[PDB]
Structures are given as structure tokens and as C-alpha cells.
Symmetry: D2
Subunit: 117 residues, 4 copies
Amino acid sequence: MRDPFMEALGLKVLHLAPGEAVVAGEVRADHLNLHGTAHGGFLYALADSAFALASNTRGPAVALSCRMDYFRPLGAGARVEARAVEVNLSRRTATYRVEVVSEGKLVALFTGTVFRL
Amino acid sequence: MRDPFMEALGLKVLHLAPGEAVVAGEVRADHLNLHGTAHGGFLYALADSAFALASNTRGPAVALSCRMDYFRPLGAGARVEARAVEVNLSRRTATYRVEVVSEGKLVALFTGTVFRL
Amino acid sequence: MRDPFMEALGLKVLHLAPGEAVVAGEVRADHLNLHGTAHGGFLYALADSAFALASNTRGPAVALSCRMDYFRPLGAGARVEARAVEVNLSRRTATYRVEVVSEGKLVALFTGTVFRL
Amino acid sequence: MRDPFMEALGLKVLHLAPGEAVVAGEVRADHLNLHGTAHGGFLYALADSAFALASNTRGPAVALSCRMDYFRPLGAGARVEARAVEVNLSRRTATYRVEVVSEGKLVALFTGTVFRL
Ligand SMILES: [Cl-]
């Protein structure tokens, strides 16, 4: 398993088991947006990566629809984690909840559904 | 206006006007996922960037909730664009639709709502 | 085609063609919520009905994920329509955009994806 | 507190406390769709009602964006519940997760964000 984008973003896996995964990273200078806070795409990439790993432990799967709800902004240097858990596993689709956490606070909530190939 | 993450991803602005924006990029080797296709986070970052620029033409705004629907995978070298248009503009919130297109095909659809500061 | 819930809500079809549908209704006294405005479930039911009809013109399909963005409240007596159009049609999934309109104003935006049986 | 639509749908409250609520109902003949299963609008109305009650325990609030993920169909006679819990409470917005359950099975997952008036 090699994910070029995860590697480019400096992400690491803290846990991987059937139906679940935790991916972590640190907000670097190149991850900031025009507001000076962690770009929504960086936080989403983090959650999506945990989502991808968790869902693929059940077999090949690709994202269909994902929702990202942002609660708190993060600045450079912030250590963040995306914790993915399985909500539903069906024959051709599956859904996961991914909590994005930093220093014990829920920074964002990701909800995604995949199509099982 | 300087967005470190957009710059790091090699994104460029093709259009910016009141309530709308178009951001473009090319899928590079470092943008691929474990599947060998454009990482969902890269495509989302592209759409989110157009969303951010379009929404901020109305004044400071931050994302609340965003949905990303994926329709077609993209490989390295693909030229992609995210076209953001305003769907609703309220006093404290606004919503935008962002079409992600590559070679005339709709690759994904992004729907997002911001909170106006 | 008989839909008990659509009938119970007093909904009517104003258009049905391949990949698209328009469903209309009027906000009645029994459709109001604790706020005295059209219940979110009534507006969603309206959009979902147009979504269901439009998607099923392509063959049997059931909803996977749907998003409803609310922009303006409606009171009793308001005439409302849900206009569904096809955004993407794939082999096993399809996505539709449904605009909820009343007196020329966009009251809400519904985005939904179905699984094709 | 009187909600005409909840009453019309035969819904009842099983729990209400700060930041949370449980609403229950039974799928009646008039709640079925063209497929002969519980209409998506009925299940959404159920979840939305729990969402509305839970969010309003914190003060007046109206829905901004809601997502409904469907996992299992329900037939006439099914007893269903929507359990709403608070995910995030901010100054002007709040987010809730609502699990739709029937006979111990997760039938659907609702995720919604409100604007606090
Ligand atoms: Cl959504």
C-alpha cells in the first residue's frame, strides 16, 4: 500500500483494522489557505485518507458521496487525526463516519459512502 | 491573495468575479492515491478552492458544510477545472455549486455552504 | 404508478420525462412544524418525490445519500415545486439536482444519489 | 410545543433533554412510496423532527444543511425511532447526528447543521 498524496502531505497511519482506520498529520506552512488556517482540502484529504483505508479493508471500494462539516479552524503546527469507523456495510455500498480531532477537540466531521467494486 | 496550499498543489485561477470562480490544475504524480487515480482530497481541494474564492468575493466567509459527489476517476496528467457558481446568498450564509470538469466531462459535483463573518 | 405518501401530502406531478421530473404541492396546515413554517420533512418529501420519479425513469433505483440545503422558510398556503434534473448517470448509480421553488424563489436545493437495481 | 406535521404523521417523543431527542413512529399505509416501502420523506421527517427538537433545546434554530443516508428499506407496520445527539455546539451554528433505528438495526443516518437565531 503506497499512497503518493498521503506521502506528499506527510500523513501517517496510526491504526488500521477491519472496518476502521486512524490517519494523522501536522498542519504545515504549505497546508494553509488564503485565511492563514488549515485549508479545507487538507483537512478533507486527511479524513478521506482514513475513510479510504477503513473502507478498503473490506475489499476494493471507491467514494460515491462525502460530507465534510467544519467546526473549528486550525493553525500551522496543529497535530490532527482522522478516526474512521464503519457505520454500515452492505453488499455493494458501505458508509463510514470520520471524526477529525486535534488536541482532544472535534475539529470536523466527515461522513462518506463508498461503492464496493 | 496568497493561498499556500493552492500554490503547493499547482492550482491556478482561470476566473474570478462577484459570486463565481474557476480554479484549474493538473493531476501530478504526487496527487495519486493508493488506487493510482487522483486522490479524492486533491479533487476536493480543487473544488474547495474555487468555492473559497467565489464565496469570499462577497466578504469574509468560512465553510460550514460541503458535499462532494464523485462520478469519474482521473489519472496522472489529467487537466481538471472547478467551476463555482452562487446558488444562494443570505445575510449570514451562502451556498455554491462547484462542477469539477475534465475534457468536457463532469468528474464530480461539489455543494457547499459558508458562514459569512 | 401510485405513491401513497405523495397522495397523502397532496402532491401532483407537473412533468415527467427521461431523467427529469417536477412535483408540486401546497403547504397545508398539517404541513407546518413547531415554528409555524413548512416542516423540513414536507419540503424534503417534495424534493425526494421528484428525485424518485426522475431517477426511476431510467429503471428501478433507490436512494443512497441525499442532501437538503434550506434557504427560505415557507408559510401555509405557499405553492411550491421541486424540479429534478439528471447530473450524472452511471451503470450502478445516478445523481440528480432538485431545485425547490416557490413564487420564483429558490427555497431549497436537494442533491441526491441513487443505487440502480 | 405543537408540531402539526409530527402530529399528522403520528410521531411521538420518547426523550427530550439538553442537546438530544428521540422521536418514534410507525410506518403506516399512507407512508409508503411507489416502491411499497417507507417513503424517504417519511423517514427523513422522522429524523428531522428529532433533529429539530434536540437543536431547539439550545435556543431557536433552523436547519441549514442536512444529509440523509439510507441503508435498509422498511415496510408497513415497522416501528422506527430517530435518536438525535449533539456533535458540535457553536455560537451561531450547531450540528447533530440522528440515527434512525428499527428493531435494533440502523436503517438510516442523518447529519444536520442548524443556524442559531
Ligand atoms: Cl451532504
